[PDB]
């Protein structure tokens, strides 16, 4: 219970509610409160219980509780709501206090666009040259922050993955690719390979099976 | 009356052995002991407590409500002997208990000469 | 027959310099391509490279420790000397002296082949950490028992001294052997009386001839039974509560007490303290416990106090045991089916879910005691709200899915409820 | 500090092959070597220059290089090979030396088994009752260490998850379960929910959609 | 008007105490259900709680830091003092003063409403007693040139002294100003001669009446041109080397030579040394450079030295520039397909992977200059082998994949290659 | 010969002022700086350098190697004066450079004093 986990970052375009969650084992039997710390200032309390709110804070910030996690809803995000939002609770017994990792609500420009990943298996011509490469192509996403994770039968693979940095397109939406290098013996052993891309918050997965569709 | 050299010899050996007393300082008890007061160990305890300055071993505070600092004669051998004997795992040492424990330990040394002489 | 035998100081203070001295026999540093270096390994962690000297006057240091290292060689009398200058209690481990060899010229990358035996190095913690003083059973005692204050430390102190404020000299002195990580003394007070109130604190030191550490935080010992008038305790709701209700303990009495205490037996936590307000010719203080759960269970007893004597409490009040437990709810069964009967599988996963029930035993049996094979019942899940949940699934063949009735029957004796739900496949 | 990263731990049943890979940005130009440290003793050199073994090392150990990663394979691991394995290499400039975090190969008493994950949508009669709960059931896995991570629409969800510790089973393989509680509107809002199970590195996933069945 | 005002030292030396104090105005700490505490924040990271003291004298500390922290409270003066004991340089950051209030008397859990402002606290990284002795331009010097040794330190040393090994009297004595704690001195060696070689070592002090610090690392200065024999440098492969083939520089001499130094003209790590093995008719020693890369490029000079006086040298050999170039390679076009089944999807993707090309401009256009409906050519990934790779995907309407024939053409101009591949899905 | 008392007083004044010479040192010099030798500066330079043991100010080592340690002139005012006077910020001083610098400064002071009395 010594850790109260929060998302590392949340970004939302103006006018859309942003939800920040604070999950921990000790939240079941202790109260919580939410703090806002604008850059270069002192943190300001927002709501001091599971649900109730201070008088001066605007009507946008409302809190809710559910099980072992409490969540904040910044209804109608505006440009002046870019800050770090923290969470507080106590230990299980009622004791030494705790502070969460804290998210960072950021307002965007162009609306968010999810990636479109296409995965291509090695051709039949690959294996004659005693080579095998899997290519993962990511295009039409914004902003430019991706992290590809190559998994073979679920278990992570970090031997041969090569990833380019995001680059600008003609549409002001970034695009990037990732290549995996495989010996022909490996590609005919595991059941399936998957190229997982994680956007700011997302996990889009594509699967290719050497034995099924080849 | 050949036990009066034995009575002092045994105690001056035992005090040196038990309390790691320096050889050049052991005989000082002879001046303050004789052939009738060696039976009672409390006299030896008083003489040690007066001359050997065992009171300096214990911690003392400079001014009331201040951090303790070690006593004056901390580095003297008698402090090391007391530390190794009476302290250690599972022991306590009050201000009053130290003369009591010293007297109890000197009683056995005193009785040793009587048992051995015959 | 290449051997290396390290040898050097093992125990060292917190701001002194370590000087190990390797000694190697079998190879000479005047041979091209060789080298000698030191590798450090903290207890149960990964290896860290420290220093290395080649067959030359060239020395390579760890970039982040370059400021506090000095490696030197003596080829005439085979040996290597390493000197760390500012050791801390984190720079303790098992230093190794190792051989070396260049892969090839053009890059000073080496592989250490002939290692040496371990060389344990430990650093004594300085007098900065303060001891922690704790008392059992509780800070407040009747004037007849004895107390055992416990002073503990996480630095390896050998001697502990206990000080009571208001007195000129130390109250007691004791020592404890420094077990692997922790040491603890067990000062035993005598039969208590009126004049044992005050703020006890205890220091620590490595021996009785060194600087004592920072003082421990004061511990308040209060002695009860030195006032004539008595106090009484009562709870506004009923003593039995349903684990979700406002509960407000009350302390009421005659007499002029301006401070009340509320203690729960079995807990060493600090007592609650509040001031009193004169209402209806009675001095009272009100303790809002707020929402109550199973934790706030036990017996609570009140205590009076006065400011003229800071560490004296009135005679203990009558216990008022508080019992908190949730009410029996009974299960609510709910059917579950995969809703995607793929034809490319032989066994389905029909099952039933039990959602909320407080009394712990519940049993699920299918087709009234039949179908004993292929049935699994997972253990109960304790929800945050305090009500258990269950699940049971049966793996039946794909052909059996069809005109074969499947139904799960459940029971919860403490609620007298039997419910039967038929899990029809969608 | 050090740039070479290794898996925290690897477990393998007797007779199989264990693969350890350490990767960094300096393995491209500078060689590598593998060390074996049994508990208490001093480390022993195993493989140097990425391809070669010593003359007094069992034939089972072999190594290979794959771009910016080097892999050491213990073919047919026996009961003796239970130790920690460190790889070392220079930095980019080839002056200083860097060790790795170091794995810990351990042999299991009983052969490993993979979880069998079955997920169930809320009943068609729960939407009438305005309460929705997904169920994820994990069965027949060894050893017992599973971390259910619910994901909705590809984004993590931690508001309502309730999980029990793995428990002993009548058969000598552990079991567990996990429940997610949803408001019906949230259940019908998203398009896909997925239970995700992590067991000794391997990851298994089962997905359901509201449109398939409500 | 509740406000908090914190003040104290803002720069503390390492391993020393910190004594922040908070002065609160607007509330009285004697009232029930209040408390003051301290909260840290490293620059950029999240907050962390340190200490708290309530209306009753109860202290809580973050368990990971219970040994070091200590909070004391005074009511009349309205001041609270935090006295963190050991300050390693990872404790820097803003320190806030907060005004904690309890929720209910059930559990000592508080919410911080009125925050302070915060005082930046910085901790000195640490000082290195050892001076650093570096020489410009390089350890190899002409027979007639003015050297400049740079004995520098960061411990606030006021004066430095230079000792040559083998001599009982200090060579020179200098001074410098403690400019922000960093000191540097530049001893000037006049016209060098045969006797200026050796191991120069420099010390430091706070003033002429202090004690001198630890010796700096020895530095070797080698005189060139003293001998008569000439040495020549010959590379066994061609002076131009394609990356990968392992260069083997060779030094030959007509005289009785023992050790050969090989230096890279640019600022390098250090000269190499090897022993000379007699060969057919010349003394020689070859340096295996291993697999060369773009780093081992520049001018190489091979000196010659004898152990009669180990710090002397022959004349520099003729410079031998070593040029490394990555040879151009021809791209190989492999055709990647959606996979055998892409049924029920309106638009499908077909593409070409160009693998292993070195000059960077490659240009892919599908079906000559047509099919510019969506061709996207992804940027290229520089593989660790040093050869680039790039791919392009054409989105196509699905039925068309049956009839429309899509094929791709690659143009790598520098290698004069045009390859066409007819991709298909089957 | 009326210049002789004036010249002697002026030169001893200059030397005492520059080097913080001890009061007894003034009369010690007057015993030797007698008018037979005020003409030259090398004689008085060497006389200062050997009478006030300026050579002891610089550090020296016991062994052939071994860390340097401050000399016998640890706290003499003359060593502190010469240290604060010559070893400033960017001034060098070897064994054979100190006598030259002292010669320069002493000659300057004597010439100035003599020609100012003139
Ligand atoms: C100091 O007192 C503590 C508290 O009692 C001791 O810790 C436990 O003591 C009880 C009996 O007093 C034993 O039954 C337990 O086994 C002890 N705990 C452990 C972990 O051993 C502690 O042992 C005492 N120490 C000394 C030196 O007397
Ligand atoms: C549970 O009941 C107690 C007892 O009434 C409540 O305590 C009072 O709360 C109100 C809230 O406005 C305060 O104005 C009173 O001053 C409180 N009483 C005392 C004696 O201080 C408590 O708030 C209730 N809890 C909930 C969650 O409603
Ligand atoms: C000793 O070191 C160097 C010798 O050149 C001097 O530092 C250079 O001079 C300027 C002006 O003093 C410095 O500000 C720069 O750091 C250097 N300039 C460069 C490198 O172009 C330094 O002044 C010398 N003297 C002292 C007393 O340090
Ligand atoms: C690089 O090429 C050189 C060509 O001489 C190789 O040099 C010798 O290789 C043999 C092979 O066993 C070694 O025994 C010798 O010690 C090497 N040096 C000399 C001076 O003969 C070198 O091995 C090659 N390296 C690689 C990695 O292929
Ligand atoms: C007591 O401890 C200090 C510090 O550890 C040590 O210097 C001293 O020698 C010790 N006392 C004795 C008698 O050894
Ligand atoms: C020289 O430095 C030491 C150490 O800081 C100091 O004690 C002394 O006063 C300083 N000055 C002189 C003239 O020694």
- CATH code of the domain covering residue C207: 2.60.40.10
How many structural domains is chain E composed of?
4
How many Å apart are CA E226 and CA E378, to the nearest integer? 61
Q: Enter the tokens of residue D197.
A: 């199970």
Mutation target among F54, F77, F81, F93 for the E interface, most CBs of E within 10 A: F93
**Chain F touched by E31 (CB under 8 Å):** no
Q: How far is D155 from chain C (nearest CA, A)?
A: 23
Contact predicate C6/C116, CB 8 Å? yes
Domain boundary among C224, C246, C264: C224
Residue-number span of the structural domain to which E173 is assigned:
128-223
How many Å apart are CA E98 and CA E212, to the nearest integer? 48
The verdict on E314 and E343 lying in the same domain is no
Contact predicate F35/F7, CB 8 Å? yes
Q: Which residues line ligand 6 (CB under 6 A)?
A: E 206-207, 209-210; F 80
Of C185, C160, C16, C39, nearest to C110 (Cα)?
C39
**How many angstroms separate the Cα of C175 from the Cα of each of B70, C169, D137, F101?**
15, 18, 56, 66
The verdict on C79 and C152 lying in the same domain is no
Q: Which residues of C touch D1 (CB under 8 A)?
A: 64
The domain limits of chain A are: 10-107, 116-208
- What is the atom index within ligand 3 of the atom nearest the CA of E186? 1
How many Å apart are CA E153 and CA C58, to the nearest integer? 20
Contact predicate D114/D204, CB 8 Å? yes
Burial C387-414 (b: 16+ CB within 10 A, else e): bbbbbbbbbbeeeeeeeeebbbbbebee
Residue whose Cα lies nearest atom 7 of ligand 6: it is: E210
User: CA E424 from chain center: how many Å?
Assistant: 49
> Which chain D residue's Cα is nearest to E244?
D29
CATH domain A116-208 topology:
Immunoglobulin-like (2.60.40)
Q: Which residues line ligand 1 (CB under 6 A)?
A: B 90; C 150, 176, 184, 186
Of C33, C29, C3, C31, nearest to C98 (Cα)?
C3
Are D159 and A21 in contact (CB < 8 Å)? yes
**Chain D touched by A162 (CB under 8 Å):** yes
SS3 A180: strand
Distance C151 CA to ligand 5 centre (A): 22
How many Å apart are CA E413 and CA E411, to the nearest integer? 6
The interface residues of chain F toward chain E in range 49-68, judged by CB-CB distance below 8 A, are 57-61, 64-65, 67-68
Q: Which residues of C touch B87 (CB under 8 A)?
A: 159, 173-175, 208
Contact predicate B45/B103, CB 8 Å? yes
Domains D10-107 and D116-212 share a fold: yes
> Which chain B residue's Cα is nearest to C183?
B89
Q: Which residues line ligand 2 (CB under 6 A)?
A: C 246, 248, 286, 288, 290
Residue whose Cα lies nearest atom 1 of ligand 4: it is: E246
Which contiguous run of DSSP H or E holds residue B47?
helix B41-51
SS (H, E, C) chain D: CCCCECCCCEEECCCCCEEEEEECCCCCCCCCEEEEECCCCCCEEEEECCCEECCCCCCCEEEEEECCEEEEEECCCCCCCCCEEEEEEECCCCCCEECCCCEEEEECCCCCECCEEEEECCCCCCCCCCCEEEEEEEEEEECCCECCCCEECCEECCCCCEECCCECCCCCCEEEEEEEEECHHHHHHCCCEEEEEEECCEEEEEEECCCCCC
Q: Which residues of C touch E289 (CB under 8 A)?
A: 104-106
Q: How far is C181 from chain A (nearest CA, A)?
A: 22
Q: How wide is the angle at C-alpha C107 spanned by C-alphas C102 and C111, nearest 5°? A: 35
SS (H, E, C) E281-346: CCEEEEEEEEECCCCCCEEEEECCECCCCCCECCCCCCCEEEEEECCCCCCEEEEECCCCCCCCCC
How many Å apart are CA C376 and CA A200, to the nearest integer? 40
The interface residues of chain A toward chain D in range 99-128, judged by CB-CB distance below 8 A, are none
Are B91 and C175 in contact (CB < 8 Å)? yes
Contact predicate E75/C135, CB 8 Å? no
**How many angstroms separate the Cα of D145 from the Cα of each of C234, D151, D167, D201, D202?**
48, 19, 10, 10, 11
Burial F40-75 (b: 16+ CB within 10 A, else e): ebeebbebbbeebebebbbbebeeeeeebebbebee
Domain boundary among E204, E223, E242: E223
The verdict on C109 and C51 lying in the same domain is yes
Q: Which residues of E touch C60 (CB under 8 A)?
A: none
Mutate to test the pocket of ligand 1, among C136, C148, C183, C186 (most ligand atoms within 8 A of CB): C186
Are C287 and E105 in contact (CB < 8 Å)? yes
Q: Enter the tokens of residue A35.
A: 């703090």
Q: Enter the tokens of residue E72.
A: 């004391």
- Cβ-proximal residues to B36 (8 Å cutoff; 6+ apart), any chain: none
Domain boundary among E165, E193, E223: E223
Are C274 and E32 in contact (CB < 8 Å)? yes
How many of the other CB atoms lie within 10 Å of CB of C175?
24
Under the phi-then-psi rule, with left for phi > 0, alpha for psi from -120 to 50, and beta for the rest, what region is A52?
A: beta
Contact predicate E263/E300, CB 8 Å? yes
- Among E59, E126, E270, the residue with its CB nearest the CB of C58 is E270
How many Å apart are CA E95 and CA E89, to the nearest integer? 15
Resolution of the coordinates in A? 3.5
> Which chain E residue's Cα is nearest to F72?
E209
SS3 B111: helix
Of E358, E354, E292, E357, nearest to E326 (Cα)?
E358
Are C376 and D98 in contact (CB < 8 Å)? no
**Chain F touched by E118 (CB under 8 Å):** no
Ligand nearest to the CA of E188: 3
Q: Which residues pair with E302 in a beta bridge?
A: E262
Contact predicate F113/F13, CB 8 Å? yes
Residues in chain C whose beta carbon is closer than 8 A to a beta carbon of chain A? 293, 295, 383-385
Q: Which residues of D touch A204 (CB under 8 A)?
A: 154
Contact predicate B21/B14, CB 8 Å? no
Distance C298 CA to ligand 1 centre (A): 26
- Cβ-proximal residues to A42 (8 Å cutoff; 6+ apart), any chain: E96, E115, E116, E117, E118
Method: cryo-EM
Q: Which residues line ligand 5 (CB under 6 A)?
A: B 80; C 206-207, 209-210
Contact predicate E221/E304, CB 8 Å? no
Mutation target among A24, A25, A29, A68 for the C interface, most CBs of C within 10 A: A29
Contact predicate C237/C247, CB 8 Å? yes
Contact predicate C259/C266, CB 8 Å? no
Q: How far is E384 from chain D (nearest CA, A)?
A: 6
Distance C148 CA to ligand 1 centre (A): 11
Ligand nearest to the CA of E285: 4
Are A68 and C384 in contact (CB < 8 Å)? yes
Sign (positive/negative) of CA torsion A92, A97, A103, A107? positive
Are C108 and E70 in contact (CB < 8 Å)? no
**How many angstroms separate the Cα of C262 from the Cα of each of A29, C234, C267?**
21, 12, 12
SS3 A111: coil
Contact predicate C135/C126, CB 8 Å? no
Q: How far is A114 from chain C (nearest CA, A)?
A: 28
How many Å apart are CA C297 and CA C323, to the nearest integer? 6
Q: How far is E347 from chain A (nearest CA, A)?
A: 12
Q: How far is E264 from chain D (nearest CA, A)?
A: 15
CATH architecture assignment, domain A10-107: Sandwich (2.60)
Q: In CATH, what number does D116-212 get?
A: 2.60.40.10
């Amino acid at each position: 219970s010594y850790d109260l986990t929060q998302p590392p970052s949340v970004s939302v375009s103006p006018g859309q509610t942003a939800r920040i969650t604070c999950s921990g084992d000790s939240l079941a039997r202790q109260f919580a409160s939410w703090y806002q710390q604008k850059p270069g200032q002192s943190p300001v309390l927002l709501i001091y219980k599971n649900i109730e709110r201070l008088s001066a804070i605007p009507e946008r910030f409302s809190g809710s509780t559910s099980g072992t996690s409490v969540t904040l809803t910044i209804s109608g995000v505006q440009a002046e709501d870019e800050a770090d939002y923290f969470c507080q609770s106590a230990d299980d017994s009622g004791s030494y206090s705790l502070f969460g990792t804290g998210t960072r609500v950021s307002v965007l420009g162009q609306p968010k666009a999810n990636p479109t990943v296409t995965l291509f298996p090695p051709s039949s011509e690959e294996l004659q040259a005693n080579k095998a490469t899997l290519v993962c192509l990511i295009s039409d996403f914004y902003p430019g922050a991706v992290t590809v994770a190559w998994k073979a039968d679920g278990s992570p693979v970090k031997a041969g993955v090569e990833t380019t940095k995001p680059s600008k397109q003609s549409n002001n939406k970034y695009a990037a690719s990732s290549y995996l290098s495989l010996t022909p013996e490996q590609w005919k052993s595991h059941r399936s390979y998957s190229c997982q891309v994680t956007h700011e918050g997302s996990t889009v997965e594509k699967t290719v099976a050497p034995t099924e569709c080849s | 009356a050949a036990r009066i050299p034995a009575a002092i010899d045994a105690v001056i050996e035992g005090i040196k052995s038990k309390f790691s007393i320096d050889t050049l300082g052991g005989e000082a008890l002879k001046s303050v002991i004789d052939g009738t007061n060696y039976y009672d160990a409390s006299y030896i305890t008083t003489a040690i407590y007066n001359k050997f300055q065992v009171s300096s071993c214990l911690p003392s505070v400079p001014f009331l409500g201040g951090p303790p600092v070690p006593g004056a004669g901390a580095n003297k051998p008698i402090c090391s002997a007391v530390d190794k004997l009476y302290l250690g795992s599972g022991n306590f040492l009050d201000k009053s208990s130290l003369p009591g424990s010293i007297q109890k330990d000197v009683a056995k040394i005193v009785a040793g000469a009587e048992q051995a002489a015959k | 027959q290449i051997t290396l035998k390290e040898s050097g100081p093992t125990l060292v203070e917190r701001t002194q310099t370590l000087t190990l001295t390797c000694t190697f026999s079998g190879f000479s540093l005047t041979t091209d391509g060789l080298g000698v270096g030191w590798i450090r390994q903290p207890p149960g962690k990964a290896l860290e490279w420290l220093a290395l000297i080649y067959y030359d006057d060239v020395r390579r240091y760890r970039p982040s420790l370059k400021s506090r290292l000095t490696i030197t060689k003596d080829t005439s009398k085979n040996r290597v000397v390493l000197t760390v200058t500012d050791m801390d209690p984190v720079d303790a481990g098992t230093y190794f002296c190792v051989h070396a060899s260049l892969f090839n010229l053009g890059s000073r990358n080496v592989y250490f082949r002939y290692w040496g035996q371990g060389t344990l190095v430990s650093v004594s913690s300085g007098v900065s950490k303060k001891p922690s003083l704790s008392v059992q059973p509780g800070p407040i005692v009747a004037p007849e028992e004895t107390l055992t204050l416990q002073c503990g430390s996480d630095a390896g102190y050998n001697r502990f001294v206990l000080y009571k404020d208001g007195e000129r000299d130390f109250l007691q002195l004791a020592g404890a052997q420094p077990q692997a990580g922790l040491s603890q003394a067990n000062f035993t007070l005598g039969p208590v009386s009126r004049s044992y109130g005050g703020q006890y604190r205890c220091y620590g030191a490595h021996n009785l001839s060194s600087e004592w550490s920072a003082p421990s935080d004061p511990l308040d010992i209060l002695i009860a039974g030195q006032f004539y008038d008595r106090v009484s305790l009562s709870v506004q709701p009923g003593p039995t509560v349903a684990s979700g209700e406002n509960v407000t303990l009350l302390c009421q009495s005659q007499g002029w007490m301006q401070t009340f205490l509320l203690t729960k037996e079995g807990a060493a936590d600090d007592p609650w303290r509040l001031r009193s307000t004169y209402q209806s010719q009675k001095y009272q203080a009100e303790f809002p416990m707020g929402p109550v759960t199973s934790a706030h269970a036990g017996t609570y007893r009140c205590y009076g106090s006065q400011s003229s004597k800071p560490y004296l409490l009135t005679h203990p009040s009558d216990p008022l045991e508080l019992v908190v437990s949730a009410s029996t709810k009974g299960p609510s069964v709910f059917p579950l089916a995969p809703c995607s009967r793929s034809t490319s599988e032989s066994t389905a996963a029909l099952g039933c879910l039990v959602k909320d029930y407080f009394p712990e035993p519940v049993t699920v049996s299918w087709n009234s005691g039949a179908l004993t094979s292929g049935v699994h019942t997972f253990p109960a899940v304790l929800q945050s709200s305090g009500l258990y949940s269950l699940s049971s699934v049966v793996t039946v063949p794909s052909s059996s899915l069809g005109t074969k009735t499947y139904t799960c029957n459940v029971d919860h004796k403490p609620s007298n409820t039997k419910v039967d739900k038929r899990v029809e496949s969608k």
